[PDB]
Amino acid sequence: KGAYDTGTYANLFQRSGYREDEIKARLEQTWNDLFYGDEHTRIYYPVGDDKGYMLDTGNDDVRSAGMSYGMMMAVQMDKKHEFDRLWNYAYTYMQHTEGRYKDYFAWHCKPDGTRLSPGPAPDGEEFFAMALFFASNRWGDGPAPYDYQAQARKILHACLHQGEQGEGDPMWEPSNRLIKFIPELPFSDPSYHLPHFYELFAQYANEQDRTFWKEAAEASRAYLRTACHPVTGLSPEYANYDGTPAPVQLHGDFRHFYSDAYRVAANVALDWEWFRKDPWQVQQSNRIQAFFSDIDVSDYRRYTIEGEPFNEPALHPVGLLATNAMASLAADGPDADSFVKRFWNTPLRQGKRRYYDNCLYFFTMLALSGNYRVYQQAAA
Ligand SMILES: O[C@@H]1[C@@H](O)[C@H](O[C@@H]2CO[C@@H](O[C@@H]3CO[C@@H](O[C@@H]4CO[C@@H](O)[C@H](O)[C@H]4O)[C@H](O)[C@H]3O)[C@H](O)[C@H]2O)OC[C@H]1O
């Protein structure tokens, strides 16, 4: 049985020989540096009396995925002030109040809140909902727009039902229960599959949707089994419903192991830790750690899912190492402990591309310290 059932979370840093006091100090200093550090480290900026944003430093914009990550980090760290500022920002500037995308979030805006595209990014919506449910379960709801569980249910209603009221498209394909890359296109993104979150949407969503969320959890576990290369454990950034790499798109080649796909190993391992349902997740974690076992972080490239290295370097190599280390939540192979130590000995990334690395870095810091947790509906 998983942490969801037992309430006990693996502390892999403590398992590797780091002291309890060292671990929680390091987690606190990671929070301090990311949220309130120097101009070359921080990725969070407070705005006015009641708002705040996570900055994609590399792209000079604010992303629904980054905002939703910030909210997950804040609720996992018991930081209600930062949580409320981030949510109020996403609510005020990014959430559609009308049209084909009503209740969805414009995927990016300028720091001042000016929308740069109207279309959503479904990985944002699902993290928003999960963070909002945890905020409800930890702190209890407030007055709108801080009625956390009501806001979460509204997002997930749109995610399954959007094209019914009028026009628009759902973010889940009804026929196969799989999350889509965007509402309009019939393919997916393996990194967007969060079966562990769907298990919890099955507990918290609008009642009529709970069966679908349960089916989505199993469908996503099965999908990820089809998406990861059987030898390397590498997955493509964009993939067809059959799990094979999607066609080259107008905005890029997403067929290879690069930025998005790093999260797959981290997501697979967190589902293992929380629910312990699919033993393939141990083997997947072993395989990706074996692929990177004698690759130094300084040599991380773009790779074909078959494991062929490009000359082109990984844009986010610290992100990749963070996700490789987070796989130690599930891995039982010879590389598990080495990756925890390698991650411990890695500082936060600095400079203009640091945002994506440091997001993945923070989730790994939470997970490997036993602090990436389910906040349930339970007796106080
Ligand atoms: O009309 C359509 C557009 O709206 C559509 O936009 C897509 C919306 O989702 C976007 O996905 C974002 C991109 O960021 C991902 O993380 C990035 C990983 O690479 C890093 O370098 C970067 O810092 C990160 O931000 C995030 O998971 C996801 O939410 C996608 O890129 C857009 O293409 O595109 C097609 C139009 O037809």
GROMACS .gro file of C-alpha atoms and ligand atoms in nm:
model
  417
    1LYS     CA    1   0.000   0.000   0.000
    2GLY     CA    2   0.114   0.357  -0.083
    3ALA     CA    3   0.159   0.674   0.130
    4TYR     CA    4  -0.208   0.767   0.046
    5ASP     CA    5  -0.322   0.458   0.249
    6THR     CA    6  -0.044   0.438   0.520
    7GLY     CA    7   0.030   0.813   0.576
    8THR     CA    8   0.407   0.725   0.580
    9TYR     CA    9   0.629   0.897   0.316
   10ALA     CA   10   0.974   0.762   0.215
   11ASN     CA   11   1.254   1.009   0.315
   12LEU     CA   12   1.525   0.907   0.063
   13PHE     CA   13   1.771   1.178   0.184
   14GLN     CA   14   1.751   1.025   0.539
   15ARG     CA   15   1.786   0.673   0.381
   16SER     CA   16   2.110   0.801   0.208
   17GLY     CA   17   2.253   0.914   0.550
   18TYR     CA   18   2.163   1.292   0.557
   19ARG     CA   19   2.047   1.415   0.905
   20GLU     CA   20   1.677   1.511   0.967
   21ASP     CA   21   1.790   1.867   1.073
   22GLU     CA   22   2.020   1.899   0.761
   23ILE     CA   23   1.732   1.785   0.529
   24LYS     CA   24   1.461   2.029   0.655
   25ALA     CA   25   1.718   2.319   0.670
   26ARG     CA   26   1.807   2.243   0.302
   27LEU     CA   27   1.433   2.232   0.201
   28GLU     CA   28   1.371   2.571   0.382
   29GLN     CA   29   1.682   2.731   0.216
   30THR     CA   30   1.562   2.598  -0.130
   31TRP     CA   31   1.222   2.769  -0.066
   32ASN     CA   32   1.397   3.091   0.056
   33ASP     CA   33   1.628   3.109  -0.252
   34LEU     CA   34   1.355   3.029  -0.514
   35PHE     CA   35   1.083   3.257  -0.364
   36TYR     CA   36   1.292   3.542  -0.203
   37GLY     CA   37   1.657   3.495  -0.325
   38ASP     CA   38   1.888   3.721  -0.537
   39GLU     CA   39   1.790   3.847  -0.890
   40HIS     CA   40   1.990   3.554  -1.053
   41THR     CA   41   1.820   3.278  -0.840
   42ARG     CA   42   1.456   3.372  -0.752
   43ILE     CA   43   1.165   3.283  -0.987
   44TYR     CA   44   0.878   3.428  -0.769
   45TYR     CA   45   0.792   3.804  -0.762
   46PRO     CA   46   0.517   3.944  -0.534
   47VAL     CA   47   0.288   4.214  -0.695
   48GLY     CA   48   0.082   4.475  -0.498
   49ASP     CA   49  -0.100   4.366  -0.178
   50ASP     CA   50  -0.262   4.038  -0.300
   51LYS     CA   51  -0.080   3.897  -0.612
   52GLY     CA   52   0.241   3.721  -0.722
   53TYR     CA   53   0.381   3.532  -1.025
   54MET     CA   54   0.637   3.264  -1.118
   55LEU     CA   55   0.859   3.402  -1.401
   56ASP     CA   56   0.978   3.182  -1.689
   57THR     CA   57   1.321   3.359  -1.679
   58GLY     CA   58   1.422   3.200  -2.016
   59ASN     CA   59   1.112   3.318  -2.212
   60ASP     CA   60   1.048   3.646  -2.011
   61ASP     CA   61   0.681   3.542  -1.953
   62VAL     CA   62   0.441   3.387  -1.694
   63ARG     CA   63   0.306   3.035  -1.775
   64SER     CA   64  -0.003   2.849  -1.639
   65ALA     CA   65   0.230   2.547  -1.574
   66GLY     CA   66   0.471   2.773  -1.373
   67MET     CA   67   0.186   2.943  -1.177
   68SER     CA   68   0.024   2.601  -1.097
   69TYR     CA   69   0.371   2.465  -0.991
   70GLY     CA   70   0.423   2.765  -0.759
   71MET     CA   71   0.082   2.694  -0.598
   72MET     CA   72   0.172   2.321  -0.552
   73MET     CA   73   0.509   2.425  -0.393
   74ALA     CA   74   0.333   2.679  -0.162
   75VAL     CA   75   0.061   2.432  -0.040
   76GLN     CA   76   0.320   2.147   0.009
   77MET     CA   77   0.535   2.396   0.217
   78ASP     CA   78   0.234   2.540   0.421
   79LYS     CA   79   0.284   2.889   0.262
   80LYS     CA   80  -0.078   3.019   0.240
   81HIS     CA   81   0.030   3.387   0.181
   82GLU     CA   82   0.232   3.295  -0.137
   83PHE     CA   83  -0.036   3.039  -0.243
   84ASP     CA   84  -0.316   3.305  -0.225
   85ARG     CA   85  -0.106   3.566  -0.416
   86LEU     CA   86  -0.021   3.314  -0.696
   87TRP     CA   87  -0.383   3.187  -0.724
   88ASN     CA   88  -0.527   3.547  -0.721
   89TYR     CA   89  -0.283   3.636  -1.009
   90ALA     CA   90  -0.385   3.328  -1.219
   91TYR     CA   91  -0.756   3.391  -1.131
   92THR     CA   92  -0.737   3.770  -1.210
   93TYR     CA   93  -0.529   3.766  -1.538
   94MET     CA   94  -0.521   3.410  -1.691
   95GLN     CA   95  -0.863   3.241  -1.629
   96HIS     CA   96  -1.118   3.286  -1.918
   97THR     CA   97  -1.463   3.405  -1.793
   98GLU     CA   98  -1.630   3.350  -2.140
   99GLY     CA   99  -1.580   3.185  -2.482
  100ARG     CA  100  -1.461   2.844  -2.608
  101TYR     CA  101  -1.195   2.843  -2.321
  102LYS     CA  102  -1.426   2.956  -2.031
  103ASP     CA  103  -1.274   2.841  -1.692
  104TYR     CA  104  -0.946   2.736  -1.870
  105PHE     CA  105  -0.630   2.955  -1.831
  106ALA     CA  106  -0.456   3.146  -2.116
  107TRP     CA  107  -0.127   2.947  -2.112
  108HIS     CA  108   0.101   3.257  -2.089
  109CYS     CA  109   0.092   3.630  -2.009
  110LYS     CA  110   0.342   3.916  -1.963
  111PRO     CA  111   0.449   3.983  -1.600
  112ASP     CA  112   0.187   4.272  -1.592
  113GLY     CA  113  -0.093   4.015  -1.673
  114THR     CA  114  -0.128   4.096  -2.050
  115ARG     CA  115  -0.227   3.763  -2.219
  116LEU     CA  116   0.022   3.654  -2.494
  117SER     CA  117  -0.201   3.362  -2.620
  118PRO     CA  118  -0.568   3.274  -2.549
  119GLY     CA  119  -0.521   2.892  -2.576
  120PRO     CA  120  -0.466   2.685  -2.256
  121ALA     CA  121  -0.201   2.425  -2.156
  122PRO     CA  122  -0.382   2.129  -1.988
  123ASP     CA  123  -0.086   2.048  -1.754
  124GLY     CA  124  -0.159   2.392  -1.594
  125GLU     CA  125  -0.532   2.316  -1.532
  126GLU     CA  126  -0.461   1.977  -1.363
  127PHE     CA  127  -0.189   2.120  -1.130
  128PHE     CA  128  -0.419   2.421  -1.048
  129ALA     CA  129  -0.702   2.178  -0.951
  130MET     CA  130  -0.474   1.942  -0.744
  131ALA     CA  131  -0.308   2.242  -0.559
  132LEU     CA  132  -0.657   2.396  -0.498
  133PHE     CA  133  -0.794   2.064  -0.353
  134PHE     CA  134  -0.485   2.037  -0.122
  135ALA     CA  135  -0.534   2.406  -0.016
  136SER     CA  136  -0.901   2.323   0.074
  137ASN     CA  137  -0.792   2.004   0.264
  138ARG     CA  138  -0.503   2.181   0.457
  139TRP     CA  139  -0.650   2.530   0.528
  140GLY     CA  140  -1.027   2.500   0.453
  141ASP     CA  141  -1.202   2.719   0.190
  142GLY     CA  142  -1.226   3.100   0.216
  143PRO     CA  143  -1.453   3.354   0.043
  144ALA     CA  144  -1.439   3.364  -0.343
  145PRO     CA  145  -1.202   3.354  -0.516
  146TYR     CA  146  -1.031   3.158  -0.226
  147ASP     CA  147  -1.318   2.897  -0.219
  148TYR     CA  148  -1.040   2.652  -0.315
  149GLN     CA  149  -1.234   2.323  -0.366
  150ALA     CA  150  -1.520   2.509  -0.551
  151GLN     CA  151  -1.260   2.668  -0.789
  152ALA     CA  152  -1.091   2.322  -0.842
  153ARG     CA  153  -1.426   2.151  -0.923
  154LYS     CA  154  -1.510   2.432  -1.173
  155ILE     CA  155  -1.174   2.384  -1.359
  156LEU     CA  156  -1.220   2.002  -1.377
  157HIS     CA  157  -1.586   2.047  -1.491
  158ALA     CA  158  -1.457   2.252  -1.793
  159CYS     CA  159  -1.171   1.995  -1.848
  160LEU     CA  160  -1.428   1.711  -1.912
  161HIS     CA  161  -1.741   1.900  -2.038
  162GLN     CA  162  -1.619   2.221  -2.224
  163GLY     CA  163  -1.774   2.154  -2.573
  164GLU     CA  164  -2.123   2.059  -2.435
  165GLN     CA  165  -2.260   2.397  -2.303
  166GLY     CA  166  -2.175   2.566  -2.640
  167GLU     CA  167  -1.843   2.551  -2.834
  168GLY     CA  168  -1.494   2.455  -2.708
  169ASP     CA  169  -1.325   2.114  -2.656
  170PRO     CA  170  -1.255   1.906  -2.342
  171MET     CA  171  -0.890   1.848  -2.234
  172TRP     CA  172  -0.964   1.470  -2.197
  173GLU     CA  173  -1.061   1.254  -2.502
  174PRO     CA  174  -1.386   1.077  -2.389
  175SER     CA  175  -1.316   0.762  -2.602
  176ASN     CA  176  -0.978   0.672  -2.432
  177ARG     CA  177  -0.986   0.880  -2.099
  178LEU     CA  178  -0.645   1.038  -2.196
  179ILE     CA  179  -0.535   1.403  -2.139
  180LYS     CA  180  -0.461   1.590  -2.465
  181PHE     CA  181  -0.167   1.820  -2.558
  182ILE     CA  182  -0.431   2.100  -2.622
  183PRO     CA  183  -0.814   2.081  -2.651
  184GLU     CA  184  -0.818   2.104  -3.038
  185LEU     CA  185  -0.552   1.836  -3.126
  186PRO     CA  186  -0.593   1.451  -3.114
  187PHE     CA  187  -0.256   1.363  -2.949
  188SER     CA  188  -0.104   1.388  -2.600
  189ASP     CA  189   0.214   1.472  -2.401
  190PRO     CA  190   0.337   1.189  -2.170
  191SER     CA  191   0.463   1.445  -1.906
  192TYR     CA  192   0.095   1.568  -1.867
  193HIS     CA  193  -0.024   1.221  -1.741
  194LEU     CA  194  -0.076   1.245  -1.361
  195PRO     CA  195  -0.264   0.922  -1.265
  196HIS     CA  196  -0.189   0.998  -0.893
  197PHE     CA  197  -0.377   1.335  -0.930
  198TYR     CA  198  -0.671   1.162  -1.116
  199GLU     CA  199  -0.702   0.912  -0.821
  200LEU     CA  200  -0.756   1.224  -0.600
  201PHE     CA  201  -0.988   1.403  -0.854
  202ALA     CA  202  -1.196   1.074  -0.824
  203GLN     CA  203  -1.231   1.164  -0.449
  204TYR     CA  204  -1.286   1.546  -0.474
  205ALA     CA  205  -1.435   1.632  -0.823
  206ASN     CA  206  -1.807   1.685  -0.903
  207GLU     CA  207  -1.983   1.352  -0.824
  208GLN     CA  208  -2.094   1.270  -1.185
  209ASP     CA  209  -1.724   1.294  -1.298
  210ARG     CA  210  -1.569   1.065  -1.028
  211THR     CA  211  -1.596   0.736  -1.231
  212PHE     CA  212  -1.425   0.900  -1.535
  213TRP     CA  213  -1.137   1.030  -1.312
  214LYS     CA  214  -1.090   0.671  -1.173
  215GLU     CA  215  -1.082   0.535  -1.536
  216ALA     CA  216  -0.845   0.823  -1.638
  217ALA     CA  217  -0.602   0.714  -1.357
  218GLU     CA  218  -0.577   0.355  -1.498
  219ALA     CA  219  -0.581   0.475  -1.864
  220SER     CA  220  -0.286   0.716  -1.792
  221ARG     CA  221  -0.085   0.440  -1.607
  222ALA     CA  222  -0.139   0.212  -1.915
  223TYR     CA  223  -0.055   0.503  -2.156
  224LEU     CA  224   0.281   0.577  -1.978
  225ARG     CA  225   0.367   0.199  -2.005
  226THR     CA  226   0.322   0.238  -2.389
  227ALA     CA  227   0.512   0.577  -2.407
  228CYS     CA  228   0.848   0.479  -2.243
  229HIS     CA  229   1.113   0.303  -2.457
  230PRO     CA  230   1.149  -0.059  -2.333
  231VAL     CA  231   1.539  -0.048  -2.303
  232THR     CA  232   1.620   0.322  -2.224
  233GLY     CA  233   1.304   0.428  -2.029
  234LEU     CA  234   1.310   0.752  -2.241
  235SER     CA  235   0.979   0.901  -2.364
  236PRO     CA  236   0.902   1.158  -2.636
  237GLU     CA  237   0.782   1.513  -2.544
  238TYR     CA  238   0.465   1.475  -2.767
  239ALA     CA  239   0.306   1.131  -2.834
  240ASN     CA  240   0.005   0.978  -3.019
  241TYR     CA  241  -0.273   0.802  -2.815
  242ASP     CA  242  -0.090   0.469  -2.903
  243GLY     CA  243   0.219   0.611  -2.718
  244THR     CA  244   0.445   0.648  -3.030
  245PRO     CA  245   0.614   0.989  -3.093
  246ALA     CA  246   0.367   1.244  -3.244
  247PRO     CA  247   0.441   1.399  -3.588
  248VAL     CA  248   0.683   1.698  -3.614
  249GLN     CA  249   0.473   2.013  -3.534
  250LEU     CA  250   0.491   2.362  -3.695
  251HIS     CA  251   0.646   2.509  -3.370
  252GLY     CA  252   0.908   2.228  -3.317
  253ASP     CA  253   1.024   1.861  -3.325
  254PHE     CA  254   0.885   1.703  -3.001
  255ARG     CA  255   0.963   1.335  -3.094
  256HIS     CA  256   1.279   1.312  -2.874
  257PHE     CA  257   1.373   1.299  -2.503
  258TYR     CA  258   1.392   1.672  -2.407
  259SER     CA  259   1.251   1.932  -2.158
  260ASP     CA  260   0.882   1.816  -2.124
  261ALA     CA  261   0.965   1.440  -2.104
  262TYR     CA  262   1.197   1.483  -1.799
  263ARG     CA  263   0.882   1.502  -1.577
  264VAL     CA  264   0.765   1.150  -1.686
  265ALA     CA  265   1.017   0.967  -1.454
  266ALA     CA  266   0.925   1.209  -1.166
  267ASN     CA  267   0.544   1.168  -1.218
  268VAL     CA  268   0.572   0.782  -1.252
  269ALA     CA  269   0.775   0.765  -0.924
  270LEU     CA  270   0.534   0.995  -0.728
  271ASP     CA  271   0.233   0.775  -0.834
  272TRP     CA  272   0.435   0.467  -0.718
  273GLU     CA  273   0.508   0.639  -0.378
  274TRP     CA  274   0.146   0.761  -0.324
  275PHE     CA  275  -0.056   0.458  -0.457
  276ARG     CA  276   0.195   0.168  -0.529
  277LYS     CA  277  -0.049   0.032  -0.797
  278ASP     CA  278   0.166  -0.047  -1.107
  279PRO     CA  279   0.490  -0.246  -1.048
  280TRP     CA  280   0.609  -0.151  -1.403
  281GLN     CA  281   0.684   0.194  -1.242
  282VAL     CA  282   0.975   0.038  -1.041
  283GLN     CA  283   1.121  -0.112  -1.367
  284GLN     CA  284   1.070   0.217  -1.564
  285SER     CA  285   1.252   0.405  -1.280
  286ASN     CA  286   1.536   0.142  -1.286
  287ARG     CA  287   1.567   0.172  -1.671
  288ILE     CA  288   1.591   0.558  -1.688
  289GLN     CA  289   1.843   0.558  -1.397
  290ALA     CA  290   2.048   0.280  -1.576
  291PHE     CA  291   2.045   0.487  -1.903
  292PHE     CA  292   2.188   0.796  -1.718
  293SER     CA  293   2.399   0.598  -1.457
  294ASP     CA  294   2.740   0.673  -1.613
  295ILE     CA  295   2.636   1.001  -1.792
  296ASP     CA  296   2.770   1.312  -1.606
  297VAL     CA  297   2.515   1.603  -1.590
  298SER     CA  298   2.774   1.815  -1.792
  299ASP     CA  299   2.718   1.570  -2.089
  300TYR     CA  300   2.330   1.559  -2.087
  301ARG     CA  301   2.207   1.598  -2.449
  302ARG     CA  302   1.886   1.579  -2.648
  303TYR     CA  303   1.837   1.199  -2.714
  304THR     CA  304   1.617   0.988  -2.946
  305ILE     CA  305   1.395   0.763  -2.723
  306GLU     CA  306   1.618   0.474  -2.856
  307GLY     CA  307   1.907   0.646  -2.666
  308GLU     CA  308   2.104   0.803  -2.958
  309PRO     CA  309   2.268   1.128  -2.836
  310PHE     CA  310   2.247   1.451  -3.042
  311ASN     CA  311   2.541   1.700  -3.035
  312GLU     CA  312   2.281   1.953  -2.902
  313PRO     CA  313   2.303   1.980  -2.519
  314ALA     CA  314   2.002   1.945  -2.283
  315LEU     CA  315   1.868   2.304  -2.234
  316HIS     CA  316   1.767   2.213  -1.872
  317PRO     CA  317   2.031   1.961  -1.750
  318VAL     CA  318   1.973   2.034  -1.376
  319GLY     CA  319   1.597   1.975  -1.437
  320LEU     CA  320   1.685   1.636  -1.602
  321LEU     CA  321   1.909   1.533  -1.305
  322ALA     CA  322   1.631   1.644  -1.060
  323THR     CA  323   1.374   1.414  -1.238
  324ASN     CA  324   1.634   1.125  -1.262
  325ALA     CA  325   1.685   1.161  -0.880
  326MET     CA  326   1.305   1.180  -0.810
  327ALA     CA  327   1.277   0.832  -0.981
  328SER     CA  328   1.452   0.696  -0.663
  329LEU     CA  329   1.098   0.715  -0.506
  330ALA     CA  330   1.030   0.394  -0.710
  331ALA     CA  331   1.375   0.261  -0.829
  332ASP     CA  332   1.524  -0.040  -0.637
  333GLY     CA  333   1.820  -0.082  -0.884
  334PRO     CA  334   2.192  -0.011  -0.823
  335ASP     CA  335   2.171   0.363  -0.920
  336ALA     CA  336   1.893   0.481  -0.678
  337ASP     CA  337   2.118   0.599  -0.389
  338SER     CA  338   2.386   0.753  -0.620
  339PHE     CA  339   2.118   0.977  -0.787
  340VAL     CA  340   1.989   1.100  -0.442
  341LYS     CA  341   2.351   1.195  -0.345
  342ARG     CA  342   2.423   1.356  -0.690
  343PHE     CA  343   2.104   1.568  -0.648
  344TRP     CA  344   2.190   1.663  -0.283
  345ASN     CA  345   2.534   1.782  -0.412
  346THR     CA  346   2.369   1.995  -0.689
  347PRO     CA  347   2.291   2.363  -0.613
  348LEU     CA  348   1.992   2.551  -0.762
  349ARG     CA  349   2.057   2.665  -1.122
  350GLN     CA  350   2.150   3.035  -1.177
  351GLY     CA  351   2.127   3.256  -1.489
  352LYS     CA  352   1.861   3.325  -1.748
  353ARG     CA  353   1.744   2.963  -1.818
  354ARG     CA  354   1.711   2.863  -1.448
  355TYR     CA  355   1.324   2.866  -1.417
  356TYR     CA  356   1.242   2.513  -1.556
  357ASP     CA  357   1.549   2.348  -1.391
  358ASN     CA  358   1.459   2.504  -1.052
  359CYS     CA  359   1.085   2.409  -1.069
  360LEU     CA  360   1.183   2.039  -1.126
  361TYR     CA  361   1.460   2.085  -0.862
  362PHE     CA  362   1.205   2.204  -0.597
  363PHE     CA  363   0.964   1.910  -0.661
  364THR     CA  364   1.260   1.665  -0.625
  365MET     CA  365   1.367   1.841  -0.296
  366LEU     CA  366   1.008   1.796  -0.162
  367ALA     CA  367   0.980   1.432  -0.286
  368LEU     CA  368   1.326   1.303  -0.171
  369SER     CA  369   1.271   1.459   0.178
  370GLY     CA  370   0.926   1.286   0.214
  371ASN     CA  371   0.749   1.629   0.191
  372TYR     CA  372   0.557   1.582  -0.143
  373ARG     CA  373   0.235   1.460   0.023
  374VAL     CA  374  -0.139   1.399  -0.024
  375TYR     CA  375  -0.343   1.642   0.197
  376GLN     CA  376  -0.660   1.432   0.244
  377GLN     CA  377  -1.010   1.507   0.375
  378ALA     CA  378  -0.940   1.375   0.725
  379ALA     CA  379  -1.009   1.430   1.097
  380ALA     CA  380  -0.792   1.716   1.239
  381LIG     O1  381  -0.323   2.776  -3.054
  381LIG     C1  382  -0.228   2.675  -3.012
  381LIG     C2  383  -0.145   2.725  -2.896
  381LIG     O2  384  -0.223   2.787  -2.783
  381LIG     C3  385  -0.059   2.607  -2.851
  381LIG     O3  386   0.010   2.645  -2.732
  381LIG     C4  387   0.061   2.537  -2.662
  381LIG     C5  388   0.009   2.551  -2.518
  381LIG     O4  389   0.087   2.467  -2.430
  381LIG     C6  390   0.227   2.501  -2.435
  381LIG     O5  391   0.283   2.411  -2.340
  381LIG     C7  392   0.345   2.471  -2.222
  381LIG     C8  393   0.487   2.504  -2.266
  381LIG     O6  394   0.568   2.507  -2.152
  381LIG     C9  395   0.579   2.374  -2.099
  381LIG     O7  396   0.699   2.370  -2.018
  381LIG    C10  397   0.819   2.425  -2.090
  381LIG    C11  398   0.927   2.319  -2.108
  381LIG     O8  399   1.037   2.385  -2.188
  381LIG    C12  400   1.105   2.491  -2.115
  381LIG     O9  401   1.222   2.547  -2.183
  381LIG    C13  402   1.006   2.605  -2.081
  381LIG    O10  403   1.067   2.696  -1.985
  381LIG    C14  404   0.880   2.550  -2.014
  381LIG    O11  405   0.785   2.660  -1.998
  381LIG    C15  406   0.457   2.345  -2.016
  381LIG    O12  407   0.455   2.204  -1.971
  381LIG    C16  408   0.331   2.370  -2.101
  381LIG    O13  409   0.232   2.416  -2.013
  381LIG    C17  410   0.282   2.470  -2.575
  381LIG    O14  411   0.424   2.494  -2.586
  381LIG    C18  412   0.210   2.553  -2.678
  381LIG    O15  413   0.246   2.509  -2.813
  381LIG    O16  414   0.038   2.574  -2.954
  381LIG    C19  415  -0.020   2.544  -3.086
  381LIG    C20  416  -0.130   2.646  -3.128
  381LIG    O17  417  -0.204   2.592  -3.236
   0.00000   0.00000   0.00000
